[PDB]
Symmetry: C3
């Protein structure tokens, strides 16, 4: 899976090791092995969420097969909100998630595409 | 709506408050309430636009229903170019926009997905 | 084409001029003119790739017509991996690419959309 987190929290207000802990949480929540989990954290950005520049975060989650229905994404959302609200000290109104299904022909890995 | 702006202008050459003013402009242009507008500004990046590393900006706009046709996006583009060229002091050849339709099952909000 | 590169290498470990050289390489690999090539490099991020926080990079490539099949993307992947592994001094296991087809109605250029 690919997780991208944008936040207006400065880097020194993002807890050390968040990218590693988010990697472990995402493996458990999405049901994918941790060695296939990718996390990108981009802190110190200028952001408005729901019209407000108060501290906030945006998460994007892309994966094959497991983020393509409302029922699957409702379950994932509950767990990712629980993890991020407590790690970043943010209220549930200061985070939004976007889910993007991917297919195997879109992923370049070790110099090829493995669309088995 | 979700707006993401990447620029190679350093943070101290991006006008203070741009994220707030872009939030208000996007509400008016896209016809969505300001409390549903999200803006992310990522300055100080290394960028080439149209093969040139001169100052530039890339905007991505994602929304339900209103960015899915050429006719709708032509109208939005005129207004967003007018706003960004004047705020960032950039020529119209130094900005590009990408439009991405979203559906309600892709948005995680307050720990769930509200696909009514 | 639009290329976005995220890396946890600090800016001072990314070779000067990478965005310009990636622009020239992408024109040759994708078969598009260099004056239509866009590159965004975002260094100094916190990242885990395949569960590891060792140096890594993520590349996203978006274009009309030429990134929409496994056969086309397999060819592109070989060349982009060769270029990035050697420029960034990274092993082939520390880079991943995602490919995204675009259509002409999604691109705002000079204040309009040119969907001919
Ligand atoms: O099993 C596959 O078809 C395959 C091929 C290339 C990449 C991946 C893959 C998929 C996911 C995902 O579904 O979230 N995440 C990471 C990878 C990867 O192996 O790097 C899966
Ligand atoms: O009304 C909906 O179905 C719904 C459900 C969850 C989120 C949103 C929403 C939509 C947009 C958009 O169309 O640009 N932007 C923001 C939101 C949101 O409420 O946060 C809309
Ligand atoms: O020829 C087109 O239809 C057209 C219209 C507007 C933009 C572009 C374009 C396409 C690509 C791509 O296919 O990778 N990249 C850049 C552009 C652009 O001209 O800026 C192409």
């Amino acid at each position: 899976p690919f997780l991208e987190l944008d936040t207006n929290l400065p880097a020194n207000r993002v807890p050390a090791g968040l990218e590693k802990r988010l990697c472990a949480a995402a493996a458990s929540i999405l049901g994918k092995p941790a060695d296939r989990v990718n996390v990108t954290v981009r802190p110190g950005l200028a952001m408005a969420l729901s019209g407000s520049t108060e501290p906030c975060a945006q998460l994007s989650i892309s994966s094959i097969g497991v983020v393509g229905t409302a029922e699957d994404n409702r379950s994932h959302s509950a767990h990712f909100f629980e993890f991020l609200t407590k790690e970043l000290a943010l209220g549930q109104d200061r985070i939004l998630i976007r889910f993007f299904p991917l297919e195997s022909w879109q992923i370049g890995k070790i110099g090829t595409v493995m669309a088995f």
